[PDB]
Design a protein around this motif. Structure first.
Motif, PDB file in Angstrom:
ATOM      1  N   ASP A 296       0.798  -1.229   0.000  1.00 25.38           N
ATOM      2  CA  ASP A 296       0.000   0.000   0.000  1.00 25.38           C
ATOM      3  C   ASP A 296       0.826   1.273   0.000  1.00 25.38           C
ATOM      4  OD1 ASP A 296      -2.982  -0.783   0.313  1.00 25.38           O
ATOM      5  OD2 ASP A 296      -1.992  -2.006   1.863  1.00 25.38           O
ATOM      6  N   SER A 297       0.363   2.265  -0.750  1.00 29.95           N
ATOM      7  CA  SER A 297       1.043   3.548  -0.832  1.00 29.95           C
ATOM      8  C   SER A 297       0.020   4.645  -0.633  1.00 29.95           C
ATOM      9  CB  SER A 297       1.730   3.721  -2.193  1.00 29.95           C
ATOM     10  OG  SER A 297       2.784   2.784  -2.370  1.00 29.95           O
ATOM     11  N   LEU A 298       0.435   5.721   0.014  1.00 27.86           N
ATOM     12  CA  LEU A 298      -0.457   6.836   0.276  1.00 27.86           C
ATOM     13  C   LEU A 298      -0.818   7.544  -1.026  1.00 27.86           C
ATOM     14  CD1 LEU A 298      -1.343   7.426   3.125  1.00 27.86           C
ATOM     15  CD2 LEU A 298       0.196   9.404   3.136  1.00 27.86           C
ATOM     16  N   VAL A 299      -2.106   7.739  -1.276  1.00 23.85           N
ATOM     17  CA  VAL A 299      -2.527   8.607  -2.370  1.00 23.85           C
ATOM     18  C   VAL A 299      -2.376  10.031  -1.864  1.00 23.85           C
ATOM     19  CG1 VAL A 299      -4.471   9.457  -3.707  1.00 23.85           C
ATOM     20  CG2 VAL A 299      -4.042   7.028  -3.563  1.00 23.85           C
ATOM     21  N   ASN A 300      -1.313  10.681  -2.308  1.00 24.00           N
ATOM     22  CA  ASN A 300      -0.928  11.973  -1.808  1.00 24.00           C
ATOM     23  C   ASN A 300      -0.054  12.552  -2.890  1.00 24.00           C
ATOM     24  OD1 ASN A 300       0.197  14.108  -0.241  1.00 24.00           O
ATOM     25  ND2 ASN A 300       1.882  12.775   0.320  1.00 24.00           N
ATOM     26  N   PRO A 301      -0.378  13.738  -3.397  1.00 24.11           N
ATOM     27  CA  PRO A 301      -1.566  14.468  -2.945  1.00 24.11           C
ATOM     28  C   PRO A 301      -2.838  13.892  -3.558  1.00 24.11           C
ATOM     29  CG  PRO A 301      -0.466  15.688  -4.676  1.00 24.11           C
ATOM     30  CD  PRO A 301       0.419  14.515  -4.363  1.00 24.11           C
ATOM     31  N   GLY A 302      -2.683  12.888  -4.415  1.00 26.67           N
ATOM     32  CA  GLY A 302      -3.816  12.255  -5.065  1.00 26.67           C
ATOM     33  C   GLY A 302      -4.313  13.042  -6.261  1.00 26.67           C
ATOM     34  N   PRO A 303      -5.548  12.627  -6.793  1.00 25.58           N
ATOM     35  CA  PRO A 303      -5.980  13.441  -7.946  1.00 25.58           C
ATOM     36  C   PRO A 303      -6.446  14.823  -7.502  1.00 25.58           C
ATOM     37  CG  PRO A 303      -7.813  12.075  -7.342  1.00 25.58           C
ATOM     38  CD  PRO A 303      -6.649  11.565  -6.554  1.00 25.58           C
ATOM     39  N   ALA A 304      -6.900  15.640  -8.448  1.00 25.13           N
ATOM     40  CA  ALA A 304      -7.362  17.009  -8.121  1.00 25.13           C
ATOM     41  C   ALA A 304      -8.778  17.206  -7.564  1.00 25.13           C
ATOM     42  CB  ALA A 304      -7.174  17.906  -9.336  1.00 25.13           C
ATOM     43  N   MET A 305      -8.882  17.752  -6.348  1.00 24.04           N
ATOM     44  CA  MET A 305     -10.176  18.006  -5.695  1.00 24.04           C
ATOM     45  C   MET A 305     -10.150  19.199  -4.734  1.00 24.04           C
ATOM     46  SD  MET A 305     -11.518  14.204  -4.679  1.00 24.04           S
ATOM     47  CE  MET A 305      -9.872  13.668  -4.230  1.00 24.04           C
ATOM     48  N   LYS A 402       7.852  13.751 -15.669  1.00 22.77           N
ATOM     49  CA  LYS A 402       7.898  12.923 -16.863  1.00 22.77           C
ATOM     50  C   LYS A 402       6.690  12.001 -16.878  1.00 22.77           C
ATOM     51  CE  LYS A 402      10.929   9.689 -19.326  1.00 22.77           C
ATOM     52  NZ  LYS A 402       9.788   9.004 -20.001  1.00 22.77           N
ATOM     53  N   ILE A 403       5.958  11.976 -17.987  1.00 24.95           N
ATOM     54  CA  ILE A 403       4.811  11.086 -18.117  1.00 24.95           C
ATOM     55  C   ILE A 403       5.455   9.710 -18.281  1.00 24.95           C
ATOM     56  CG2 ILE A 403       2.902  10.427 -19.574  1.00 24.95           C
ATOM     57  CD1 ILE A 403       2.627  13.295 -20.437  1.00 24.95           C
ATOM     58  N   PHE A 410      -4.330   8.351 -18.891  1.00 19.45           N
ATOM     59  CA  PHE A 410      -5.470   9.231 -19.047  1.00 19.45           C
ATOM     60  C   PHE A 410      -5.165  10.606 -18.490  1.00 19.45           C
ATOM     61  CE2 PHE A 410      -9.553  11.035 -17.542  1.00 19.45           C
ATOM     62  CZ  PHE A 410     -10.061  11.284 -18.797  1.00 19.45           C
ATOM     63  N   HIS A 411      -5.341  11.636 -19.313  1.00 15.22           N
ATOM     64  CA  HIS A 411      -5.098  12.998 -18.867  1.00 15.22           C
ATOM     65  C   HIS A 411      -3.801  13.084 -18.081  1.00 15.22           C
ATOM     66  CE1 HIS A 411      -6.817  16.927 -19.063  1.00 15.22           C
ATOM     67  NE2 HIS A 411      -6.341  17.168 -17.855  1.00 15.22           N
TER      68      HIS A 411
END
Ligand SMILES: CO[C@H]1O[C@H](COS(=O)(=O)O)[C@@H](O[C@@H]2O[C@@H](C(=O)O)[C@@H](O[C@H]3O[C@H](COS(=O)(=O)O)[C@@H](O[C@@H]4O[C@H](C(=O)O)[C@@H](O[C@H]5O[C@H](COS(=O)(=O)O)[C@@H](O)[C@H](O)[C@H]5NS(=O)(=O)O)[C@H](O)[C@H]4O)[C@H](OS(=O)(=O)O)[C@H]3NS(=O)(=O)O)[C@H](O)[C@H]2OS(=O)(=O)O)[C@H](O)[C@H]1NS(=O)(=O)O
Lengths: 517, 104, 103
Positions: A296-305, A402-403, A410-411
């Motif tokens: 497990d890894s922290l979703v940080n900062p995660g997607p945009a909200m 870098k992508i 996606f995006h």
């Protein structure tokens, strides 16, 4: 030897549609790993859990990292860009390395002596083919400092590979950096390198002045109906019926819409006032975290909200924000007055709040006996018709990332903010070429392990041309500009204190100017 | 790929970004509510900040090649993941793209 | 008010400093800015050439004017010269208003 290699250019030039920000700094490069490639793992760093386990290599190379907005823009230039432009993107970069000196420190009898070695060199290459693990864009330290007056030391390059605990798998690769064509530089030689950015979308540096769920004409009704009443209202015996109303200026919530808010991945909501939070250790337990290959890894900062709803500044998503640290702030368990938590609230117009359900969905089929049930949607992937904004940029935050080279993305806009690039500015790697101490007078097949202690210094310039998108607002009343508060303080903001220590008091974003949706 | 999407950092450098590290004062006898922030580093690789996320998912049931390790029931159709279309169910097979198993 | 020529664009300020030269940095990366430097100072020469426009005196006066002159009497040490220890000194403040002209 007796002639400078370059000059000190560290200023911005505004040409209306573009701005060229140059920034020179002085660096220092020590000899890392004593010129050795050492294999590192979570067990060498003192062991860890399975989530923190790793396997990589340390290298003797340092690398230049100018991937932060404050390395290029001054607090004033950033304000002149934030208050007048609607978007901006980088166009071309021009890195230069000069005025190189390879000092040789010889510690004999407690007395340290540092003399320049005019014949010593340094190797510096740039991986333009992206054949090496790309490390920039992970928000690491070691950037050109924000203040031009100070000198920084160059970070050490090390990469990671696949692992199975602290061990290496079959596919784990070992990259020797000495296997690339470097460019030896003595004092008197300089390194020049140019780069031109691919076509990336402008960064939307404006907020919206309209909410995505209030894009109607508040004076007219719709010609579209909606289930308004399901039960005859009173009598005594109110029964089942079906009434339809037309959306209107009073039922703005029931009207018909063409679009939906951006995607969601719900976060836990913590309060800046610790007395309002539950008394438990949920820093890791109550966190939102993706699972990948069993760990497990922290979703940080995660997607945009969005960070919070209206009138709730005290609350911030647990991981959903970028937290910078004030000047001199420590590394571990530092308190909340030692950090600066960013506020992503200007996107509450299109993006859902990070700490609330996305929507509600029907979970069954209502019937004569079964009644209408509904569930709360915590995680919601994209759907046709969605629209959202990306995370802001932050004069202290990253510029690009870098992508990843995958066959599906996606995006590809980085979750930490910035510009996602498939071919980002390459990594400029640099090390001091080894200089062996006096070898035996009889041949020994063993590699020489005794070296002359040295380090190099010199200047580095980085010029970036940014394309701007000037604001053409036809609004009538004044907008919201970023301004230094007029009240008198002890010390000016974004200036050196009485000890010569430069400090950025707060995190400045770009979303100041507003625009319609 | 020779690198994991959640291990694309420099294992020698820390980040300049903080994260909620501690929520409760650790011991005393009376440990209470607090807020501590740490910087992601080579030892907290799991808590660091990332720019990307793993590909999409549609969870599947996990069966063992050794039939003695599987539940003793007929779940070939019952415990299967299957999309609904116009009132009838169809097996999601092979379904979207996902790794078969974890390490070992 | 202190005398001189008031200029809107006066000779610019020539600023100069010694570029910092850091002492040997740690062998492990520290995000902190380097505060240890090699002690140094620079020396050298500097020239400054100025061209002045003059306005020669065309006095049609008859008797002699008042010139600035070093008084002829014998002194211990010459004025505007170094003393016996090599210390140069200007004994008095010399202005410009010596020649006269009508109003
Ligand atoms: C947890 O499971 C348990 O509860 C759930 C529901 O509860 S829950 O939601 O809280 O979890 C049960 O699941 C629901 O009910 C199921 C069931 O009752 O079997 C099932 O319902 C759907 O299918 C039923 C049968 O359909 S059929 O086409 O296969 O026959 C159906 O009920 C039947 O309705 C028909 C009908 O109204 O037409 C009845 O047929 C009768 O009339 C027909 C037409 O009439 S007419 O006048 O001649 O024109 C005649 O042609 C027919 O000959 C005649 N049959 S007769 O024998 O009475 O003579 C038939 O009798 C009824 O059984 C459901 O429709 S409904 O009418 O009952 O509303 C239909 N779903 S629905 O139409 O969308 O409502 C579903 O699996 C499920 O439906 S639900 O509405 O989503 O809940 C579950 O079965 C139960 N199992 S348990 O736990 O093991 O006890």
């Amino acid at each position: 030897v007796g002639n400078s290699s370059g000059n000190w250019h560290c200023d911005s030039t505004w040409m209306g549609d573009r701005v060229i920000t140059t920034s020179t700094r002085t660096w220092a490069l020590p000899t890392y790993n004593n010129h050795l490639y050492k294999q590192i793992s979570n067990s060498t760093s003192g062991g860890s859990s399975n989530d923190n386990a790793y396997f990589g290599y340390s290298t003797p190379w340092g690398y230049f990292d100018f991937n932060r907005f404050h390395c290029h823009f001054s607090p004033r230039d950033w304000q002149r860009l934030i208050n007048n432009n609607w978007g901006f993107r980088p166009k071309r970069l021009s890195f230069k390395l000069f005025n190189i000196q390879v000092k040789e420190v010889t510690q004999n009898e407690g007395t340290k002596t540092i003399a320049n070695n005019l014949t010593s060199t340094i190797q510096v290459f740039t991986d333009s083919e992206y054949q090496l693990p790309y490390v920039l864009g992970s928000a690491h330290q070691g950037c050109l400092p924000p203040f031009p007056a100070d000198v920084f030391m160059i970070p050490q390059y090390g990469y990671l590979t696949l692992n199975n605990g602290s061990q290496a798998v079959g596919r784990s690769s070992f990259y020797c950096l000495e296997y690339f064509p470097s460019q030896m530089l003595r004092t008197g030689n300089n390194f020049q390198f140019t780069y031109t950015f691919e076509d990336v979308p402008f960064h939307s540096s404006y907020a919206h002045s309209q909410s995505l769920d209030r894009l109607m004409n508040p004076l007219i009704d719709q010609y579209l109906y909606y289930l308004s009443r399901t039960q005859t209202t009173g009598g005594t015996t109110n029964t089942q019926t079906l009434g339809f109303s037309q959306g209107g200026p009073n039922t703005m919530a029931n009207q018909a819409k063409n679009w939906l808010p951006g995607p969601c991945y719900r976060q836990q909501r913590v309060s800046k006032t610790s007395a309002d939070n539950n008394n438990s250790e949920y820093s890791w337990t109550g966190a939102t975290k993706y699972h990948l290959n069993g760990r497990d890894s922290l979703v940080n900062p995660g997607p945009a909200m969005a960070s919070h709803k209206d009138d709730e500044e005290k609350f911030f998503p647990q991981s959903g924000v970028l937290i910078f640290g004030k000047q001199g702030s420590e590394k571990t368990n530092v308190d909340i007055e030692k950090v600066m938590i960013t506020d992503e609230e200007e996107i509450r117009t299109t993006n859902p709040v990070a700490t609330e359900q996305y929507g509600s969905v029907s979970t069954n089929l209502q019937r004569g006996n079964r009644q209408a049930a509904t569930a709360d949607v915590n995680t919601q992937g994209v759907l046709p018709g969605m629209v959202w904004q990306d995370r802001d940029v932050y004069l202290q935050g990253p510029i690009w990332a870098k992508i990843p080279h995958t066959d599906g993305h996606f995006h590809p806009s980085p979750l930490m903010g910035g510009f996602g690039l498939k071919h980002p500015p390459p990594q400029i790697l640099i090390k001091n070429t080894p200089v062996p101490a006096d070898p035996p007078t009889t041949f020994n097949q063993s590699k020489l392990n005794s070296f002359i202690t040295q380090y190099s210094t010199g200047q580095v310039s980085v010029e970036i041309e940014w394309e701007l998108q000037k604001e053409n607002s036809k609004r009538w009343n004044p907008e919201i500009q970023y301004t230094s508060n007029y009240y008198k303080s002890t010390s000016v903001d974004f200036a050196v204190n009485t000890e010569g220590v430069y400090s950025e008091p707060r995190p400045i974003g770009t979303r100041y100017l507003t625009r319609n949706l």
